[PDB]
Short mmCIF file of C-alpha atoms in Angstrom, two decimals:
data_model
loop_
_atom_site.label_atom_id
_atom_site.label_comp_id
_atom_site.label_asym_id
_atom_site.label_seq_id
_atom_site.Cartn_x
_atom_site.Cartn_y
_atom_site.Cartn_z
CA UNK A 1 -1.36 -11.08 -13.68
CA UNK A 2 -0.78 -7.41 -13.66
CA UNK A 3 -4.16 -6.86 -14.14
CA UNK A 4 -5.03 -8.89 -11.00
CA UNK A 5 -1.90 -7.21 -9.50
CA UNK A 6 0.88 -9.21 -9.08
CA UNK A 7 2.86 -5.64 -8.39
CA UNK A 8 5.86 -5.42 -10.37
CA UNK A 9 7.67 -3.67 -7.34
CA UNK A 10 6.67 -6.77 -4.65
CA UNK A 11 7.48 -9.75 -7.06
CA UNK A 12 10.95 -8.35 -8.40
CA UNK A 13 13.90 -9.17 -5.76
CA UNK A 14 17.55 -8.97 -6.18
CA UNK A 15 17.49 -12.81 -6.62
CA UNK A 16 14.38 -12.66 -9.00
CA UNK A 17 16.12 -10.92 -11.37
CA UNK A 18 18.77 -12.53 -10.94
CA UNK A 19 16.81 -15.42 -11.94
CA UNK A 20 15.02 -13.76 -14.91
CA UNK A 21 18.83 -12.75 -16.16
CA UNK A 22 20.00 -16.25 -15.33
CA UNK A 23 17.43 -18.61 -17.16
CA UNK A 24 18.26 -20.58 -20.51
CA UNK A 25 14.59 -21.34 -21.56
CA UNK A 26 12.26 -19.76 -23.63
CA UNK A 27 13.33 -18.05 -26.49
CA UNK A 28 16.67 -17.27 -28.52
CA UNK A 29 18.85 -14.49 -27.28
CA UNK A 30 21.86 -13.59 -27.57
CA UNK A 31 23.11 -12.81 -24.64
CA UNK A 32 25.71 -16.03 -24.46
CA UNK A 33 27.75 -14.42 -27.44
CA UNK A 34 27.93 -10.93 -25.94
CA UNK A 35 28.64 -11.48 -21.84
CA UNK A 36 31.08 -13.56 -22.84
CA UNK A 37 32.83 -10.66 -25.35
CA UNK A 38 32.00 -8.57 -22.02
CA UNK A 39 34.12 -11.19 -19.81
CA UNK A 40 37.00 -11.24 -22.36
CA UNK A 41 37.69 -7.45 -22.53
CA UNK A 42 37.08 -6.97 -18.86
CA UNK A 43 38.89 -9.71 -17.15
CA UNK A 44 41.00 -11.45 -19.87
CA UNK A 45 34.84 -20.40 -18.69
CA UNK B 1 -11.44 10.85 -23.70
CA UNK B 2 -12.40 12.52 -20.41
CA UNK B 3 -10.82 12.89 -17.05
CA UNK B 4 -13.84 12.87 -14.69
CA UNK B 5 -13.53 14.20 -11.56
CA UNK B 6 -15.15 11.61 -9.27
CA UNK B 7 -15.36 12.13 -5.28
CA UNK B 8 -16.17 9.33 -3.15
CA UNK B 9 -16.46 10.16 0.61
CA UNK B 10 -15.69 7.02 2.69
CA UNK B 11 -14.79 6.33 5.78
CA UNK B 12 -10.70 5.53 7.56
CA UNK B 13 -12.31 3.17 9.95
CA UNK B 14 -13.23 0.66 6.95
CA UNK B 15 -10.66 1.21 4.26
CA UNK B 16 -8.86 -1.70 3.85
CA UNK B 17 -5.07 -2.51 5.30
CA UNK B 18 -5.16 0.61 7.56
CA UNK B 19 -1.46 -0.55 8.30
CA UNK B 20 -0.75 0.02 5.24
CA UNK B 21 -2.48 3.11 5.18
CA UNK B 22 -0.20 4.83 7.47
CA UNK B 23 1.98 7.82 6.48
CA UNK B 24 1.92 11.79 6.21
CA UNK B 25 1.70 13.65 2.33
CA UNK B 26 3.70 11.08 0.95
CA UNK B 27 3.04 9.52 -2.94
CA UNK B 28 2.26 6.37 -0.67
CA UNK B 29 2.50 2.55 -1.67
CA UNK B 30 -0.87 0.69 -2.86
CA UNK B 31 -1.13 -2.85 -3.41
CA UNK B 32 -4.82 -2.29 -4.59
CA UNK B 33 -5.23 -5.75 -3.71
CA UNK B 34 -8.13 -6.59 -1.54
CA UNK B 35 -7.63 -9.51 0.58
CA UNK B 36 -11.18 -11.36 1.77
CA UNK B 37 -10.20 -12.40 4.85
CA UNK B 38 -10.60 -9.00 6.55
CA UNK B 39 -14.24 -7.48 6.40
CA UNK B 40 -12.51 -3.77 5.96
CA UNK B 41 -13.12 -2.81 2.43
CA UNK B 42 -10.71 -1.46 -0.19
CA UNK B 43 -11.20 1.89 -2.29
CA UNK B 44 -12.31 1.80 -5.48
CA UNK B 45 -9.24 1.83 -7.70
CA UNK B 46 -11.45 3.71 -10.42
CA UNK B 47 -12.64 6.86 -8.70
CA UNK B 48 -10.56 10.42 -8.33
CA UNK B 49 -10.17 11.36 -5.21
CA UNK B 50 -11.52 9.95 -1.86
CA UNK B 51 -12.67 11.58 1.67
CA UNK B 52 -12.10 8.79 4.29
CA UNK B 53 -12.78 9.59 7.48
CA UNK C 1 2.41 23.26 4.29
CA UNK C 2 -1.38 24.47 4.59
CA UNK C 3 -2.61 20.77 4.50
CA UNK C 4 -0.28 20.04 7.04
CA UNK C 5 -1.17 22.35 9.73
CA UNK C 6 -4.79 22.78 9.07
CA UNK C 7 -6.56 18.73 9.28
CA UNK C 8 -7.41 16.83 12.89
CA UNK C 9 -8.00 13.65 13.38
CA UNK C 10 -9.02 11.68 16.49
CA UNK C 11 -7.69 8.82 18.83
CA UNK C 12 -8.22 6.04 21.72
CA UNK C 13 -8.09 6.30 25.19
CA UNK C 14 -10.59 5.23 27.94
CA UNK C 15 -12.10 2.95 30.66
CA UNK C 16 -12.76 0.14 28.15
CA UNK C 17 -16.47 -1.56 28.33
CA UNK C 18 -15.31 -5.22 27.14
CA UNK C 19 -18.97 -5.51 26.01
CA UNK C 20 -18.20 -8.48 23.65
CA UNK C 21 -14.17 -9.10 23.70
CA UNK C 22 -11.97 -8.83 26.95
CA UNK C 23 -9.77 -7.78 23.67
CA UNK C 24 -11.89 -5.01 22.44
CA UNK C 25 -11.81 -2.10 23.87
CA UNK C 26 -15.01 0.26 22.29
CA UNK C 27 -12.06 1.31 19.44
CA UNK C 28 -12.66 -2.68 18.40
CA UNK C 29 -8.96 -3.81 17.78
CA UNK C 30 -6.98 -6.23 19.48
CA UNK C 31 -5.69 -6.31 23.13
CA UNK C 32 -2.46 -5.54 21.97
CA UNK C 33 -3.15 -3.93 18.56
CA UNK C 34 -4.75 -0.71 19.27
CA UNK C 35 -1.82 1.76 18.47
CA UNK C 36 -17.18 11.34 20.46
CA UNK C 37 -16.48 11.47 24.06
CA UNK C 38 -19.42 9.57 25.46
CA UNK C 39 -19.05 5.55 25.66
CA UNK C 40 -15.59 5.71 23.51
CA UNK C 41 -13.87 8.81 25.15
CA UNK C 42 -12.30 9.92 21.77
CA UNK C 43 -10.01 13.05 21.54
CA UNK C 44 -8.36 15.27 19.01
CA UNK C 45 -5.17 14.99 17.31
CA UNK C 46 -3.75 15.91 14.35
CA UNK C 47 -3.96 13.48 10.74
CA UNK C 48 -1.21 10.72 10.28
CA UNK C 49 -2.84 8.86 6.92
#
Protein backbone atom coordinates (compact mmCIF):
# COMPACT_ATOMS: atom_id res chain seq x y z
CA UNK A 1 0.00 0.00 0.00
CA UNK A 2 3.10 2.03 0.26
CA UNK A 3 4.02 1.08 -2.93
CA UNK A 4 0.72 2.40 -4.38
CA UNK A 5 1.20 5.28 -1.86
CA UNK A 6 -0.89 5.30 0.88
CA UNK A 7 1.70 8.19 2.34
CA UNK A 8 2.73 7.42 5.70
CA UNK A 9 2.57 11.26 6.57
CA UNK A 10 -1.41 11.65 5.20
CA UNK A 11 -2.77 8.35 6.81
CA UNK A 12 -1.09 8.82 10.38
CA UNK A 13 -3.32 11.32 12.65
CA UNK A 14 -3.15 11.99 16.26
CA UNK A 15 -6.21 9.66 16.62
CA UNK A 16 -4.68 6.99 14.19
CA UNK A 17 -2.08 6.37 16.31
CA UNK A 18 -3.83 6.57 18.89
CA UNK A 19 -5.68 3.78 17.48
CA UNK A 20 -2.63 1.74 16.34
CA UNK A 21 -1.35 2.17 20.25
CA UNK A 22 -4.84 1.37 21.45
CA UNK A 23 -5.78 -1.99 19.60
CA UNK A 24 -5.79 -5.54 21.38
CA UNK A 25 -5.69 -7.71 18.16
CA UNK A 26 -3.14 -9.20 16.29
CA UNK A 27 -0.27 -10.41 17.89
CA UNK A 28 1.24 -10.85 21.55
CA UNK A 29 2.87 -7.86 23.13
CA UNK A 30 3.60 -6.88 26.03
CA UNK A 31 2.69 -3.76 26.46
CA UNK A 32 -0.31 -4.60 29.19
CA UNK A 33 2.48 -5.72 31.76
CA UNK A 34 4.69 -2.66 31.29
CA UNK A 35 2.07 0.61 31.02
CA UNK A 36 0.66 -0.67 33.78
CA UNK A 37 4.33 -0.81 35.86
CA UNK A 38 4.46 2.78 34.07
CA UNK A 39 0.96 3.80 35.78
CA UNK A 40 2.06 2.40 39.20
CA UNK A 41 5.35 4.37 39.60
CA UNK A 42 3.91 7.48 38.08
CA UNK A 43 0.58 7.94 39.62
CA UNK A 44 0.37 5.34 42.47
CA UNK A 45 -7.54 0.21 36.95
CA UNK B 1 24.52 0.41 -9.05
CA UNK B 2 24.32 3.72 -10.92
CA UNK B 3 22.82 7.08 -10.24
CA UNK B 4 21.77 8.25 -13.73
CA UNK B 5 21.29 11.58 -14.31
CA UNK B 6 17.98 11.74 -16.23
CA UNK B 7 16.39 15.24 -17.45
CA UNK B 8 12.96 15.36 -18.53
CA UNK B 9 11.76 18.80 -19.80
CA UNK B 10 7.95 19.10 -19.31
CA UNK B 11 5.72 21.52 -19.14
CA UNK B 12 3.88 23.61 -15.56
CA UNK B 13 0.74 23.96 -17.51
CA UNK B 14 0.18 19.98 -17.47
CA UNK B 15 1.88 18.70 -14.37
CA UNK B 16 -0.51 17.33 -12.29
CA UNK B 17 -2.17 19.06 -8.93
CA UNK B 18 -0.65 22.49 -9.82
CA UNK B 19 -2.24 23.43 -6.33
CA UNK B 20 -0.23 21.39 -4.94
CA UNK B 21 2.55 22.47 -6.84
CA UNK B 22 2.72 25.81 -5.33
CA UNK B 23 5.66 27.06 -3.23
CA UNK B 24 9.19 28.85 -3.54
CA UNK B 25 12.80 26.55 -2.96
CA UNK B 26 11.19 24.61 -0.47
CA UNK B 27 11.88 20.44 -0.04
CA UNK B 28 8.06 20.51 -1.09
CA UNK B 29 5.28 17.80 -0.31
CA UNK B 30 4.50 15.03 -3.12
CA UNK B 31 1.78 12.70 -2.96
CA UNK B 32 3.08 11.10 -6.28
CA UNK B 33 -0.32 9.95 -6.61
CA UNK B 34 -1.98 10.58 -9.88
CA UNK B 35 -5.60 10.96 -9.68
CA UNK B 36 -7.58 10.11 -13.25
CA UNK B 37 -10.11 12.36 -12.98
CA UNK B 38 -8.05 15.39 -14.05
CA UNK B 39 -6.45 15.13 -17.66
CA UNK B 40 -3.15 17.09 -16.17
CA UNK B 41 -0.49 14.52 -15.98
CA UNK B 42 1.87 13.66 -13.12
CA UNK B 43 5.85 13.52 -13.34
CA UNK B 44 7.47 10.57 -13.62
CA UNK B 45 8.46 9.52 -10.12
CA UNK B 46 11.59 7.69 -11.74
CA UNK B 47 13.48 10.42 -13.56
CA UNK B 48 16.22 13.06 -11.93
CA UNK B 49 15.40 16.20 -12.39
CA UNK B 50 12.55 17.90 -14.41
CA UNK B 51 12.21 21.35 -16.50
CA UNK B 52 8.44 22.23 -16.37
CA UNK B 53 7.53 25.09 -17.88
CA UNK C 1 19.98 33.25 -3.52
CA UNK C 2 21.09 33.16 -7.35
CA UNK C 3 18.04 30.89 -8.21
CA UNK C 4 15.96 33.19 -6.53
CA UNK C 5 16.62 36.36 -8.24
CA UNK C 6 17.54 35.12 -11.61
CA UNK C 7 14.06 32.79 -13.04
CA UNK C 8 10.64 34.58 -14.59
CA UNK C 9 7.70 33.21 -15.03
CA UNK C 10 4.48 34.50 -16.62
CA UNK C 11 0.75 35.31 -15.68
CA UNK C 12 -3.09 36.14 -16.68
CA UNK C 13 -4.64 39.16 -17.42
CA UNK C 14 -6.82 40.25 -20.43
CA UNK C 15 -10.08 40.95 -22.36
CA UNK C 16 -11.16 37.28 -22.16
CA UNK C 17 -12.49 35.63 -25.66
CA UNK C 18 -15.08 33.08 -23.95
CA UNK C 19 -14.54 31.08 -27.18
CA UNK C 20 -15.92 27.82 -25.63
CA UNK C 21 -16.71 28.55 -21.70
CA UNK C 22 -18.28 31.92 -20.39
CA UNK C 23 -15.83 30.31 -17.55
CA UNK C 24 -12.70 30.18 -19.51
CA UNK C 25 -10.94 32.86 -20.01
CA UNK C 26 -7.92 31.96 -22.91
CA UNK C 27 -5.73 30.89 -19.45
CA UNK C 28 -8.59 27.84 -19.46
CA UNK C 29 -9.46 27.69 -15.63
CA UNK C 30 -12.51 28.35 -13.95
CA UNK C 31 -14.53 31.64 -13.59
CA UNK C 32 -13.47 31.89 -10.24
CA UNK C 33 -10.30 29.73 -10.20
CA UNK C 34 -7.81 31.55 -12.18
CA UNK C 35 -5.46 32.89 -9.35
CA UNK C 36 2.63 35.55 -25.45
CA UNK C 37 0.86 38.76 -25.66
CA UNK C 38 -1.31 38.21 -28.69
CA UNK C 39 -4.89 36.41 -28.07
CA UNK C 40 -3.85 35.59 -24.21
CA UNK C 41 -2.13 38.96 -23.20
CA UNK C 42 0.46 37.14 -20.94
CA UNK C 43 3.12 39.12 -18.92
CA UNK C 44 6.22 38.58 -16.88
CA UNK C 45 6.67 37.83 -13.36
CA UNK C 46 8.89 36.23 -11.34
CA UNK C 47 8.67 31.97 -10.46
CA UNK C 48 6.38 30.87 -7.48
CA UNK C 49 6.61 26.75 -8.08
Amino acid sequence: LIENGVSMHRFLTISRLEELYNTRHGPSNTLYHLVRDVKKREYPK
Amino acid sequence: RGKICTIGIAPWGIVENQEDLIGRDVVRPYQTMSNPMSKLTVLNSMHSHFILA
Amino acid sequence: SWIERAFYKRECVHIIPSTKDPHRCCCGRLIGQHVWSISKHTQLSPTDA
